Design a protein around this ligand. Sequence first.
Ligand SMILES: Nc1ncnc2c1ncn2[C@@H]1O[C@H](COP(=O)(O)OP(=O)(O)OP(=O)(O)O)[C@@H](O)[C@H]1O
Ligand SMILES: [Ca+2]
Ligand SMILES: [Ca+2]
Ligand SMILES: [Mg+2]
Ligand SMILES: [Mg+2]
Length: 352
Amino acid sequence: TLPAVISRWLSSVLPGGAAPEVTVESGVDSTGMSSETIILTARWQQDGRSIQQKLVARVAPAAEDVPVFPTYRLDHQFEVIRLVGELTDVPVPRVRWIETTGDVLGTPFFLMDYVEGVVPPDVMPYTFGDNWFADAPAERQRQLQDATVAALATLHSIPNAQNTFSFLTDTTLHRHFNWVRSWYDFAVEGIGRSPLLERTFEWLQSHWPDDAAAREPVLLWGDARVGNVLYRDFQPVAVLDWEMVALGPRELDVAWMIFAHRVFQELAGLATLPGLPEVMREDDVRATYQALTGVELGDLHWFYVYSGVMWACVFMRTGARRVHFGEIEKPDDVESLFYHAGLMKHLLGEEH
Ligand SMILES: Nc1ncnc2c1ncn2[C@@H]1O[C@H](COP(=O)(O)OP(=O)(O)OP(=O)(O)O)[C@@H](O)[C@H]1O
Ligand SMILES: [Ca+2]
Ligand SMILES: [Ca+2]
Ligand SMILES: [Mg+2]
Ligand SMILES: [Mg+2]
């Protein structure tokens, strides 16, 4: 049915007699969980020869699926990826079709071209070693890191960001912050409350980063991390996963990228592995970013704490879905799911 639909759209844009056939390459992750990103193969005839194209569909989840997010705007993700392609040389996939109604499949989706390359893995976290990124030479890992920071810098350098990306919206942080509170509330409905998150929201309110929030907002990638970039030869070839795209202070993206790797360092520590301590260090990342944009970054501390709430929110949703599908037993304290609770307790104990 996803394939039938793409086959149909294919029939409308290719020569008559193309007779396209679409099948699914990959509709689940490596743990057999159904995926929002679906890799498709399209085969057709042209001038008596076979053409074969891979296509990637991003589909909006149904309620029955236990969605991470309270709402979905794939149309926004579509337009941002398209605009990023038009206005920068940040590598992104070419977008092909958006169906915004949900009348065709049941739910909205968009279609992208396939980009070949490798991604530093989430399963197992790349900090666990035994993958192409963890096993590369220091120098090559650092070359990847700096290219990824450079892609970020380039996205943050797009002029008149709030004009160009206005469909995305006090300030942009205030608004982003109320969205995060909505997401938490959404997650509560599925797993129960976290006294830690609640105290953290009070903390974030009462220690607002005024200067950062009063500067000019930039386009924020969102889930800005190496696991959302396809790479060929340690250089980015597609920036993926724009579902948390927003307008906001540039610190959010930079903090997220650093913190993300911290979460995986922590996971590696708990599997008693050494991980990758020289990758994505705050000092290295700040220096590169600052060298490239000539822009001084605010203290990231508040934005680490904030990324920690957002990560906790993902874990609460991961948790709801795992218990819904019987795959794990409800933990009795939801905070047991937060690998990084320790990290956050220590950040909250700091004074900046
Ligand atoms: N345009 C594309 N071309 C080739 N492969 C892609 C493309 N988009 C996604 N993929 C494959 O699917 C994986 C998932 O992509 P993405 O991270 O955008 O999906 P997801 O559903 O949001 O996120 P997660 O991996 O966080 O669940 C990517 O690592 C990549 O292997
Ligand atoms: Ca371009
Ligand atoms: Ca203290
Ligand atoms: Mg992803
Ligand atoms: Mg995602």
